[PDB]
RNA sequence: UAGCGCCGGCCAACUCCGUGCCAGCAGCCGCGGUAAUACGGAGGGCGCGAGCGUUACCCGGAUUCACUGGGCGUAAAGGGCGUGUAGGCGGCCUGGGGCGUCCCAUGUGAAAGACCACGGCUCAACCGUGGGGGAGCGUGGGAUACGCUCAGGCUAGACG
RNA sequence: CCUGGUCCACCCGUGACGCUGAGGCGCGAAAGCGUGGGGAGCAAACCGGAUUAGAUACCCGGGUAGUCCACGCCCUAAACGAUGCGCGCUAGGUCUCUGGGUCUCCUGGGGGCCGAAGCUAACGCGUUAAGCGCGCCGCCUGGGGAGUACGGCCGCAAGGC
């Protein structure tokens, strides 16, 4: 919540190319043949997404954090296990919202399978079955492993690239669920309903913005928790 | 609770090594006659299970009416595809003057007294969609000077 | 024509229990009472979901044969009626209701609308005084719809009039038992008549 | 040139407030800003003023929206659903006070042009005078 | 006195027998070559009814000559290309005229018909009375935003 | 050598002098016609060899008109972007031709691809519009009959409109 002067890296936006112009307002000028994100109206969207935030998260509402560019998805796997809001790491399947019944369905054979693992019949039926449903529970444990909390369809989505998980954008916008997002100069701000207009790339500006959402999360709920063990996957 | 309807139903082929396999499609209409009305387009191996299926949809998919006095607000024209739709508030003791498709989804929406008219393509299917269009655009003038407040 | 022949079957048909023989339509012996299903050798077969065509079609019928009215003068009435300014439906119900035989009938002097026009054909009914043995004419709100003075001693008005005692009118009819006549007050209003009939069908078979 | 400058600015409005633009310039002519004048006053626009160009006076009319809307497709409501050009050149429209139309059954304006000024439908209707139907806006 | 058409879909009304791409039906799609709700007959049903069908013709549906109200990449449809005559169309500002445009008053718009109200033949058809209308054109007066014209000015089009 | 079109920079000059365009007039690939010339290669017709059931073809060996030039005719086409001309408006990315400039790049004109909104029956189009508009011309109104018949105009004819 003290994010105005420690906000280093995330101006830093995508090329001169590759860009979507619906962000043209989000930008402040062009460096060497890169955009930079206007640092003002950054924290002038903040204060309405965080408020919203905090408005949710006070509500007791649940939010479905979204990241596969495969540099938020060991922040992503733990900002959200923190305080309870499900998440989705590996991959975004076509589905999970709209389909949202079937994927419980998934998500009742993992508890299945998991119980099968803790009941002594792990030896009846022999190991072919014993090494089958290993690689099932497995697979099932690498998708669906923050997608099992929901019980219900959450109230809130958080995307980190709305451009790489534009499906989960799309099954958002169909069902009337918000969407927060991390947009940067690659994406289309429209779809968007409460923008956050930063890096989605560098590691540092993840982490900061996803480590104060999740302590704005916690501070909502009260009991103020420790700074995110986060720091560490820098590397 | 609902009332429900269906427009037309259909039955499609495709082919396949061997022959000719078939799939039904139909329409289906559902409303309350209060000013809500849904349309849906189920497809299925079998009659009954197309049917319902295009009720679920209809169900799912809802427009609000801006009844006044049991007519429209405001004539419409709508082109869906190659087909068009022309809607026109009417006087009552008129009645619903429309083609099979219209009736039903204006009577199903609770409409009384309007004048209708189908142009270019004649199918139910895109006249159907042009009319549940021209139910979307409609505006109230409490939705107008909504709009140009300022 | 009069469509002249049997009348239950048309209760059949129609498949709502009409009243085109006044009694016996009240008694367990309309037919309708104990054999519901539509006439013909195909009656009692699974009926397949009828066009829109064909329920209007049905409606316009049912609304017909109640009264009695050939083709021709119902398409008249309705014309008329559309031409009028007000409710097609209402100003419809309310011509139909203004015919001389069906007044007759709805005051008690005969059981049936077709007893009630051969009661009228046969000059046994007076309006303000004048005979008139039409039952096409058309009764306005004031006038005095009375009995024949040498009409009056006949069995059949003896037995109607002598089963009126204690009978209700219709709102917008009154009657003089003793005297045998009664007054046409105003025009019925679509709350006023019990008709088993949707007017908005007939008004959209007409529209095609 | 243009051909018809009325209903050039009434097309540059209907292309900018299709993209969702904050203004739009169009040339400026005395007969353009009087219509200007009629369309902020009903509320279609936020307003008008006019503006310098590198060597030439403008109009910048600023567009009006509706709140964001839900769902798919959160670009909200137009104004302006419709604006078309009736009284175009080579064949113009002219109409008697009995013959000025009602838009959308009033929901609408009809600009007329007649001898007492640049009205609208009801505004020619209540002084009792016709003329000219430049356009229609609803 | 009750008759006439229809009963595969459009389109309201289904069975039996005969026939076997024969005999035939048919407004359009089409039906008949062994078990035809389509032919023929019967029973039954549906629609009208002193009428019911057929044919012809007109308008309609037909937005299918698109003023209201259509089109031309591949469905019928952009001329092989240019120059350019008549014609059609005409950037910004001010003024005069008032031809187009608009307004008021007035004359004209016979009667019958059409519309509305009341009334006369027992109703109705038919008829009478009264009322209301109305585009267009003539005249007098007025308005000048736009189109027009004349006079002047500007430089964003055009040309140099 | 003669000559047309066109683009950019300066903001210099005229001061609406503009757009389109029924007729008219001119241009108009190939083939074809006339007169004269030329004629290496190619090559309709044709002369043969094969192949084939037959081969008036494809394949092979020859070969005339023609292709070529001058002058004069002919007016056709898948004469094609199967998209008339002009102007204004409406996200961009990339490739490229060609100018100008504070020459990472910006700006202007032209040729391509991908795509916003939007359009379209779909394919697809999408600042080179098939989008949104305006002006003007041409043309369409089911298929066959038929681009035929008659008539007219044009042409030496073939034939064309
Ligand atoms: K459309
Ligand atoms: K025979
Ligand atoms: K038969
Ligand atoms: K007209
Ligand atoms: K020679
Ligand atoms: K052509
Ligand atoms: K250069
Ligand atoms: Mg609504
Ligand atoms: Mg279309
Ligand atoms: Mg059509
Ligand atoms: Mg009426
Ligand atoms: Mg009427
Ligand atoms: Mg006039
Ligand atoms: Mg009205
Ligand atoms: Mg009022
Ligand atoms: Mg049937
Ligand atoms: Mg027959
Ligand atoms: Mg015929
Ligand atoms: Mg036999
Ligand atoms: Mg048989
Ligand atoms: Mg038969
Ligand atoms: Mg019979
Ligand atoms: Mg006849
Ligand atoms: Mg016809
Ligand atoms: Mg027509
Ligand atoms: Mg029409
Ligand atoms: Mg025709
Ligand atoms: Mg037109
Ligand atoms: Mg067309
Ligand atoms: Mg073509
Ligand atoms: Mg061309
Ligand atoms: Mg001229
Ligand atoms: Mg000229
Ligand atoms: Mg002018
Ligand atoms: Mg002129
Ligand atoms: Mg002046
Ligand atoms: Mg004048
Ligand atoms: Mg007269
Ligand atoms: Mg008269
Ligand atoms: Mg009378
Ligand atoms: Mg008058
Ligand atoms: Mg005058
Ligand atoms: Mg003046
Ligand atoms: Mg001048
Ligand atoms: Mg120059
Ligand atoms: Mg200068
Ligand atoms: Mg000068
Ligand atoms: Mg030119
Ligand atoms: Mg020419
Ligand atoms: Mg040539
Ligand atoms: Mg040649
Ligand atoms: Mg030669
Ligand atoms: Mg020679
Ligand atoms: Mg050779
Ligand atoms: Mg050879
Ligand atoms: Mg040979
Ligand atoms: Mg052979
Ligand atoms: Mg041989
Ligand atoms: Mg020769
Ligand atoms: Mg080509
Ligand atoms: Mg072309
Ligand atoms: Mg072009
Ligand atoms: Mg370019
Ligand atoms: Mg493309
Ligand atoms: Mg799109
Ligand atoms: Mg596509
Ligand atoms: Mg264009
Ligand atoms: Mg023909
Ligand atoms: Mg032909
Ligand atoms: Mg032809
Ligand atoms: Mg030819
Ligand atoms: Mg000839
Ligand atoms: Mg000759
Ligand atoms: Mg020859
Ligand atoms: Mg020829
Ligand atoms: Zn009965």
Avoid at chain 2, 52 to 72: D, F
Wanted: hydrophobic share 40%; proline share 5%; net charge positive.
């Amino acid at each position: 919540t003290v994010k105005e002067l420690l906000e280093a890296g995330v101006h830093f936006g995508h090329e001169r190319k590759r860009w979507n112009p619906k962000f043209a307002r989000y930008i402040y000028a062009e460096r060497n043949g890169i955009h930079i994100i206007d640092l003002q109206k950054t924290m002038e969207e903040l204060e309405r997404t965080f408020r919203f935030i905090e408005d949710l998260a006070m509500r007791g509402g649940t939010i479905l954090f979204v990241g596969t560019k495969k540099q938020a998805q060991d922040i992503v796997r733990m900002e959200a296990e923190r305080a309870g809001m499900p998440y989705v790491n590996q991959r975004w399947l076509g589905g999970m919202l709209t389909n949202f019944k079937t994927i419980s369905q998934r998500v009742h054979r993992l508890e299945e399978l998991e119980a099968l693992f803790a009941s002594p019949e792990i030896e009846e039926r022999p190991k072919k079955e014993q090494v089958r449903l290993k690689h099932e529970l497995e697979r099932l444990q690498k998708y669906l492993s923050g997608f099992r909390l929901l019980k219900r369809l959450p109230d809130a989505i958080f995307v980190v690239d709305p451009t790489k998980e534009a499906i989960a954008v799309r099954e958002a916008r169909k069902l009337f669920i918000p969407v927060i997002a991390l947009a940067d100069t690659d994406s289309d701000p429209d779809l968007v309903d409460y923008i956050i207009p930063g890096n989605d790339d560098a590691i540092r500006s993840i982490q900061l913005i996803l480590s104060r959402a999740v302590d704005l999360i916690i501070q909502a709920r009260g009991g103020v928790v420790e700074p995110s063990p986060s720091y560490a996957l820098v590397q | 609770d609902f009332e429900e309807k269906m427009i037309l139903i259909r039955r499609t082929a495709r082919m396949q090594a061997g022959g000719r396999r078939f799939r039904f499609g139909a329409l289906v209409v559902v409303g309350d006659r209060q000013g809500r009305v849904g349309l849906g387009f189920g497809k299925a191996p079998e009659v009954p299970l197309a049917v319902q299926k295009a009720g679920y949809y209809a169900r799912r998919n809802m427009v609000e009416v801006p009844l006044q006095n049991g007519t429209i607000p405001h004539e419409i024209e709508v082109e869906f595809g190659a087909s068009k739709i022309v809607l026109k508030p009417a006087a009552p003791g008129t009645g619903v003057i429309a083609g099979a498709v219209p009736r039903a989804i204006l009577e199903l929406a609770g409409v009384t007294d309007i004048l209708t008219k189908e142009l270019g393509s004649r199918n139910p299917i895109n006249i159907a969609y042009a009319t549940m269009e021209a139910l979307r655009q409609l505006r109230t003038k409490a939705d107008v000077e909504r709009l140009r407040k300022g | 024509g009069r469509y002249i022949g049997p009348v239950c079957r048309l209760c059949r048909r129609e498949g709502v229990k009409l009243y085109l023989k006044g009694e016996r339509c009240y008694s367990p012996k309309c037919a309708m009472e104990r054999r519901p299903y539509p006439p013909g050798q195909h009656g009692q077969k699974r009926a397949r979901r009828p066009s829109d065509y064909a329920v209007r079609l049905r409606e316009k019928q049912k609304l017909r044969r109640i009264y009695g009215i050939s083709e021709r003068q119902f398409r008249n009435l309705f014309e008329e009626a559309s031409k009028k300014k007000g409710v097609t439906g209402s100003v419809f119900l309310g011509l139909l209701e203004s015919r001389l035989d069906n007044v007759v009938y709805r005051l008690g002097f005969a059981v049936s609308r077709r007893q009630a026009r051969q009661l009228v054909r046969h000059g046994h009914i007076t309006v303000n005084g004048r005979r008139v043995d039409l039952p096409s004419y058309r009764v306005r709100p004031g006038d005095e719809i009375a009995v024949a003075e040498k009409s009056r001693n006949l069995e059949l008005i003896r037995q109607n009039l002598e089963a009126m005692k204690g009978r209700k009118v219709g709102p917008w009819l009154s009657l003089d038992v003793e005297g045998m006549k009664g007054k046409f007050l105003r025009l019925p209003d679509r709350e006023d008549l019990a008709l088993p009939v949707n007017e908005q069908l007939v008004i959209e078979f007409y529209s095609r | 040139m243009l051909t018809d400058p009325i209903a050039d600015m009434l097309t540059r409005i209907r292309n900018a407030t299709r993209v969702y633009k904050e203004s739009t310039d169009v040339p400026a002519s005395r007969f353009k800003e009087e219509i200007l004048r009629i369309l902020a006053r009903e509320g279609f626009i936020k307003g008008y003023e006019r503006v310098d160009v590198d060597g030439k006076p403008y109009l910048r009319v600023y567009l009006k929206y509706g709140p964001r809307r839900q769902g798919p497709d959160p670009r909200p409501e137009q104004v302006i659903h419709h604006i078309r050009r009736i009284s175009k050149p080579g064949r113009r429209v002219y109409v008697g006070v009995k013959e000025i139309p009602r838009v959308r059954r009033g929901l609408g304006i009809a600009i007329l042009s007649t001898s007492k000024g640049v009205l609208t439908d009801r505004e020619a209707r209540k002084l009792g005078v016709g003329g000219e139907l430049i356009c229609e806006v609803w």
